[PDB]
Symmetry: C3
Subunit: 336 residues, 3 copies
Amino acid sequence: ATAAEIAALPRQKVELVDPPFVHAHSQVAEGGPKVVEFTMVIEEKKIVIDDAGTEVHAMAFNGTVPGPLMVVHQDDYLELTLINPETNTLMHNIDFHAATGALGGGGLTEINPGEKTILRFKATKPGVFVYHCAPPGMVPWHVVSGMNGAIMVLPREGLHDGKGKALTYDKIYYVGEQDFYVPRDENGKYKKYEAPGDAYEDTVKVMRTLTPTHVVFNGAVGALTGDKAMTAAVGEKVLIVHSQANRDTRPHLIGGHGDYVWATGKFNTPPDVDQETWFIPGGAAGAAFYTFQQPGIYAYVNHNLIEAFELGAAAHFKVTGEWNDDLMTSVLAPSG
Amino acid sequence: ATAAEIAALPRQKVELVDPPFVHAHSQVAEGGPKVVEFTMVIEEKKIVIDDAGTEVHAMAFNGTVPGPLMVVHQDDYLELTLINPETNTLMHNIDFHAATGALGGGGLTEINPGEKTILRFKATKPGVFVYHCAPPGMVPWHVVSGMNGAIMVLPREGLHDGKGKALTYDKIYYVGEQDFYVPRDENGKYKKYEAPGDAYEDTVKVMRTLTPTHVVFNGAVGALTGDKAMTAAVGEKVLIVHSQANRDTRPHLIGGHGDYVWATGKFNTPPDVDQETWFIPGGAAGAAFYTFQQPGIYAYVNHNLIEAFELGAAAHFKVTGEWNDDLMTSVLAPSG
Amino acid sequence: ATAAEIAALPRQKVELVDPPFVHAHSQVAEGGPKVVEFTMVIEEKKIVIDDAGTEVHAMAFNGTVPGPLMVVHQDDYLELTLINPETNTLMHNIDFHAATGALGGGGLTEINPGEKTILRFKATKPGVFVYHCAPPGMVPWHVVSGMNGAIMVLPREGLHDGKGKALTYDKIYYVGEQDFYVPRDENGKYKKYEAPGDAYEDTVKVMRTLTPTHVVFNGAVGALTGDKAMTAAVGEKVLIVHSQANRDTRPHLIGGHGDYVWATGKFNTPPDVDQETWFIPGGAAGAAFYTFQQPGIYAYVNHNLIEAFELGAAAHFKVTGEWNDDLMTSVLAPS
Ligand SMILES: [Cl-]
Ligand SMILES: [Cl-]
Ligand SMILES: [Cl-]
Ligand SMILES: [Cu+2]
Ligand SMILES: [Cu+2]
Ligand SMILES: [Cu+2]
Ligand SMILES: [Cu+2]
Ligand SMILES: [Cu+2]
Ligand SMILES: [Cu+2]
């Protein structure tokens, strides 16, 4: 409770890392409640989202779409230092779905270019939760320009299945999924603009059709493919955290399953098991736990396959290890 | 069980109230099975749904969009007197998703202007359920002109969490979400018509694109905002019933959570907990239970933020009490 | 399981049947693990999908949209012989969402016209699961041309509720839902094409709007209405398996409920109960169990009612038996 007791608590400063990677943390909390501190600089910046050179004026927490994942434990205090540099042109703020009161922090964090703010909240509820910018009058526009990310609030005792048993992951990835609404000119070619402000009226028009032009993981078509593929090994236990701040998605691991999925993203709700494809509503985060059993390339997709393969929502995993013929075997290879 | 047994049961006449309020009722059932009696008159009427004077020909149970919430207990009989006055122009009926047989009651209740009908059914399954009009050949048209609502079938012992702890609400609010399909002319302006029949062909064209022009709560943009804000106090337990007869929604309380959410709306299915954003599929109702911990303004939204902030799907809660600094605090107010 | 052990398992050839019917199987497995063998031939053919004569070039497992349901039990091996006849024009393959490895078997089954393949996998997880075609660089096009179906992997002990009480169905039906994306010319008329590859660029343009032209059960508007309605009696227990390989759906039985719904489709996840409307995400199969209580015509719909009644997603059940006045009665008939 008391502001004096909260001053007595240990501090712990964390350096953030860019998605899909997640900063060092422990699954089981060592010691009692802490004030965990993060800093993020907001950058408005031109990003290129596909191979044609299509451009978006992105509004990015820490310079990335999505914003980085922050990890705390249940009953920690998270303390954010949020900086809007004077080179920015817009007011921004932050709403944590994880937090209680003042529009998730958004009423207390309104910062113009050149301003900074520090917010603290108590992470009372365990799970993965979306955060996003939400300035009055301009909420969808900042969210759909990439201004969103996730936090994970781990239970103090680490993850468990529905019936008590410990689930320890070997590695964790964060896939942030983004719907973009890029205006087209008379000839169906993507438009380009000088400042974010100039794109406003044209983007609102595309938004009102409810149809994105691109749906991407980590900011761009193919950002998580080729040599940017996520990696694992046969027998390795992976947690995939997935968020969508504005629109529904239906993740699917091609060649795999979600062994335990917290599809609502909340760790006091017991996970579904043996999932082929799970569902994360717009404005939520989810998490899926899988142990790889076969080596090779996997694709991780939004299973609206038009959104996956036409709009850009596909990532790769490259998995090393030995093939298991009991699980699957080619009895007769393709032959005439 | 037998007709004679039903004829012996006490009757209870209930006066309906307009959404978002809900008629007087008891959470734990007072005594044994009753025949609960309700009367609704159907009104066809022009409504104005936005601040630009946009009109819809609404087809409204008891004159409101959505129609009123009816509350019974498990194993009561709901006996509905449905009235279609001579001042109306179309045939209407009612399908309760809570009922078993004859298309939810739809096949037994087709009434022309000038007619009435009395339907009785046993409320065998506890939960919140959609009701809606469904005239053969004309089902979606009546549903997206506002002709839908919800009933709540309480367990006789009241609400309980997933492991038997009782859940008593202080307040209950009914939010009905509606997708509308308003035709435009060649110049972008919404069309007006002089009767409901005349809008039919044009509306069907809009409906087939599957893209609503407006998504609203309680019949209009801003219906439940500012001074028509729903009210609670810090410490109050509130039940929010949300329905959508046609299209999916993803409710979120900005600054809050769904402590217990029956996302499917069915009380024999254990609620999800600590929800940030939950999902209600088109054709269903869901309910969220939450204890306010912080005072101030809260927005209640469909978290496709385009639908919420551009299309109309936003309500307010005004909450009184004192601020809890342990839960959230501004460490450094915005500043250069 | 030693190599010797796998090698000596009994084999069983199963003859497939067309949706919405399901091949003969037992709910409780009889005996120990088996290798269950199925054969399917791929057919590219023009089908008529609505009452206006709109045609599509379907890419059809076994000649049907959806593909047939295959039924095995947990820890059975499923061994599929997949044939692509010389008269087809395109390479096809298969990805079982039930299988582990090589893109669900898609990396091992790429067959040109004139070729066959045999894939074997162990069915380790119980549930209903989508299967679909998935050729590299053309995945959505084969899926939305109807090249998808479902399998059911039953628990060895049959279905159970949450409480561990057995659930035994009398009848099972498979409803495959398909989103089609049919191009139109500038007059608003649906286009017709000579060969499947001719339709490609125009179809991808419709696909990118994310708005299907038609949403149908069993390959056409009205396919499961009228004389082809599904049948049951008062007192029968019915399992409805439903799949959608690309797009969300929200099934509803008008006049009925889902007593037990495995909405995610996976039998180790306890079912939801007393459902009005349930939700199956694109890329999944779901299952609903219901005991009919009343006779009459029921409609079974996607409960986006525009998709149901304007785009084609509506089926019928005709149920025989006697009316129960306790459950519902007309006290005063329209007057
Ligand atoms: Cl896939
Ligand atoms: Cl929000
Ligand atoms: Cl319906
Ligand atoms: Cu912003
Ligand atoms: Cu939000
Ligand atoms: Cu009506
Ligand atoms: Cu309905
Ligand atoms: Cu194919
Ligand atoms: Cu798939």
